[PDB]
Design a protein that fits this description.
The structure is cut from a larger assembly and holds 7 protein chains of 7 kinds.
Chain A (H helix, E strand, L loop, with lengths): L1 E7 L2 H14 L11 E13 L10 E15 L18 E7 L1
Antiparallel strand pairs in A: 1-3, 1-4, 2-3
Chain C lengths: L11 H15 L26 H15 L5 H7 L3 E2 L7 E2 L4 H13 L14 H21 L10
Antiparallel strand pairs in C: 1-2
Chain F lengths: L11 E3 L4 E3 L4 H5 L7 H11 L12 H12 L30 H15 L2 H8 L17
Antiparallel strand pairs in F: 1-2
The chains are: A mainly beta (99), B mainly beta (60), C mainly alpha (155), D mainly alpha (185), E alpha+beta (72), F mainly alpha (144), G alpha+beta (141).
Chain C binds one RNA strand of 257 nucleotides through helix 1, helix 2, helix 3, strand 2 and helix 4.
Amino acid sequence: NITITITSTKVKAVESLCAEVKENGKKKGVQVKGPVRIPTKTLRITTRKTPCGEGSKTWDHYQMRIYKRVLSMKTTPETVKEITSLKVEPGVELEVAMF
Amino acid sequence: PVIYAQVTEILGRTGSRGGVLQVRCDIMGENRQILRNVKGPIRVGDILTLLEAEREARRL
Amino acid sequence: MHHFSNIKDVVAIDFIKAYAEHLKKSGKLEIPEWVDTVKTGMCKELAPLNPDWIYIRAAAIARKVYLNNGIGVMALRRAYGDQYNKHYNPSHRTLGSGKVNRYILQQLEKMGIVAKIQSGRSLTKEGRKDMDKIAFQVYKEHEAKVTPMILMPMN
Amino acid sequence: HTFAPKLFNKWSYDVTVSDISLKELLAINSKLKYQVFLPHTAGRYQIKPFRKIQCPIVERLVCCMMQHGKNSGKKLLAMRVVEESFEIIHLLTEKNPIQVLVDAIINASPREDSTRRQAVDVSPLRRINQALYLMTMGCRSAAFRNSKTLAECLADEIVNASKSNTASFAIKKKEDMERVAKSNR
Amino acid sequence: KLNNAVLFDKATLDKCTKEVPSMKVITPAVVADRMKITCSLAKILLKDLEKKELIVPVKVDNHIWIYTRSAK
Amino acid sequence: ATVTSESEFQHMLRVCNTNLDGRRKVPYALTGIKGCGRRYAYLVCKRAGIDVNKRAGLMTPAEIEKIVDILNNPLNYKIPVWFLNRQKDNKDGKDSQLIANAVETRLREDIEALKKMRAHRGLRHYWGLRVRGQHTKTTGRRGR
Amino acid sequence: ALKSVQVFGKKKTAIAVCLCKEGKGMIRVNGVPLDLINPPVLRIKVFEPLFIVGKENYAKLDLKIRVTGGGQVAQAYAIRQAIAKALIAYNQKFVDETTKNELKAKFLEYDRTLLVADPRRCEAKKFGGPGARAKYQKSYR
RNA sequence: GCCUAUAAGACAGAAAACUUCUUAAAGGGACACAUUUCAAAAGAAAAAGGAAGCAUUCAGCAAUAACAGGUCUGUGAUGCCCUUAGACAUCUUGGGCCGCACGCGCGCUACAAUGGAGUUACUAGAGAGUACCGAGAUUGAAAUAGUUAAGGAAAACUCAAAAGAACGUACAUGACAGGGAUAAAUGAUUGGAAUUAUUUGUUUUGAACGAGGAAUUCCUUGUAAUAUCGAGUCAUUAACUCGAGAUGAAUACGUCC
């Protein structure tokens, strides 16, 4: 039993990678478990806009978003994802965790 | 002791604060129209309760 | 309709009163010497007014072990906790006094009611037997006293 | 087959209204939605003009019984207080408590007010709002720092304002405003 | 200012027994007012009258007590 | 709902050179003593066995005396040490026994002893300022 | 066997997932009977779906409701939606339409929110004020 | 496997399909289209249908021109001037930034019975966490907190609601048990260091405060109001701010005073 999890700041990126692994899993792989979508993490920071204390007290809202997807394979420990890189796009991390 | 005046239609409002409407009302017992100032809210179908009918409230 | 399967089918405060006096007649619960000299937690300002406050608390703690599989002492401390409003600051939640909860939990182990789960405490087969036996008695009196809302007369 | 909801399993809605000027603005028995077991509904009666007239009248009395700082949002408190007071009202006058409240609203609502001063009429919806405003205000003041309970102070307020009694706070206020407006023609 | 009763006397109790059941609406608040006794006492007296069956309860709870006259 | 005996209800009870309201219950009238508060009153009633719901004006002389001895002999009446007011006493002895009109004199004498010792806390008591280290710029503005 | 349907009702945050099944008329909420709802003043409000059309419409039906959100009064309205919807969905799947339409018509003519959720939700707090709309006091001098 | 029922189930510990709830992607879904009326037109007001009909609501971005509005004490962004070995550089110890006759602003808690106190069952969302960070469980005990100590780089473990509700012949209108300032004698935490109390427990002390003058602030619907939870700061310290949910008013649908 093998488990794959991909995390990135871009939602459109992981959907492409999730599809690619599923498409790639026809050969050198038996089945392609659907991408389990772990709830999104949001990293909020609220900060004052002014370098000083003058003026109206106006704040600005920033937020990072983390998208987490979980894939499970069967395959073989030796074969795994083989290349497992596919010149992976920047900011999108893939890690493979078997048992 | 009182008489009722069903609202016919609403002219508009009164002194610039606009808390009082001018409503034209007719009395069912004598089919006679009258113009009265009312403290809102009001709607077209409402029927008032008047203790006096000789006051033609016009605000000049 | 109504049917009895466990203690969730009877009123909790009515069951706790029933389980309180049964422990009293049984007499297997030992009274600590500091019973009158303590309050149930930091937040409170007066000691419990009920003379048998130990026995009522023991029934409530027994019920919590019935419903929840494994409960630590701290989970009981927060369950029996009040709001700390002793000053001008707005009140915030606080824990109960862990000693009285740990002591009564330890006492319930002596009478063979609770057990030692590797991550808390549980009930025993005989402890479950007594708990539901009293609960069924509460169910019968409840039904014979009030009428169900489902069978409440149409009005 | 014939659902006839009541009040808290004790009071019915077969009320009649003397004042025809308030017949259409009072939610009592004209529609099935107005007959409710509880005066607790989460309906949105303040999203359009003249929508609060669709709220049950007993509920409106509860919502005004929720005033001042430390009573905000305690509808369960005001529900219990009104429910207890309705039993007392039935005991005192031996009528339908809903029927008495209908008579209280009619008799404790001014029919004439003054405004810059000039005497102006009071619209039917204002009369209902002011009736529940004056009755609740008097009960709150009477029960403050008093041994009597709110249900006791609400019950005698309604029954006094019901027929004509001038001991009620609402009747005192109503006769005060109309006398001022009468001199302000 | 009122210092109503605290504890009972022969003079107040005799009138308490004779006229409290004869009213229409009975709650610890009013009987405290009319009979000039503390509301804690009104709870004791009303309980005894209930046991002696001269007043019938219409609503008794942890929030308010309402009794009334009984003729049956 | 029983007619109380008129000779039993004392409107005041003179306990430890102070009188207590007889209308209040036993613990809440026992709070009238300057040395005893609410929690101490409840424990004292339980130790000496007086019913907590009885009115203090109906306390018999036998019970009244039984209240007194525990008040000024609390250590031998199984009262915890932490429950006491004046622990680790100076001027010899380690018993609190401050449940009397002696609570202020003990307070007063130390301040005078502290004033003699000329410490910062004692000096602030002399000047009549806030003693426990608080802001005096805006609050404590009793006009003078 | 055991013809069953699944419905759900929603309030501000409360979610009442029900499982309408053939049975003897028992309704359970989180394992406890409907007659032992913790805020007792709201019990006849939760029971009002039963009386709107007659308890016989639920006599052969057993329910198992799970409520896992919101406060306490909100959960009362979620259960009201779950019970009313459960009858409507069940009569659509295993009974003809004219019964379902009659039942839903009876629900609608009394209260619309019995079958449709209330969309009101809490507004986000905004800076400069202690709430959604209110703002901190302004001092001039 | 255990337990009670008249007869269904409950709990523990397995283990397999399942997708209404949950999670989250892609699409779909309202554009006022359509009816009635009002103004040939742009359009307006009901009502019905709908999850949604004020541009659907709340926010983000938000033009031209300007102030010599604040910051050179955020910057190794920076011009000119000042000091530059007895320094206005830098380091060390102690203190102050908390100092109180008073005046003003932002707030927290109250003046109680729509309540305080004693017990019982409760019910969210969004947060945050390790080479010592968040800390389960067991124990020591009156409490703070102490000695041992799992799992967790986390939908996996920690992390948990209280306002309100329910129980009693409790309190009964009295600065009373409302109020908890001010002082006292003592127990511990963090810290190299706690006196000018860091924070906090215990017992005692029981002050103004009885709804507030002239004036003045914020707010139109899950909004105000009420009480609480999380996060920022954080060795230790929230009555502050930024967020989140809990219960859910009244009053307009107006007019330029």
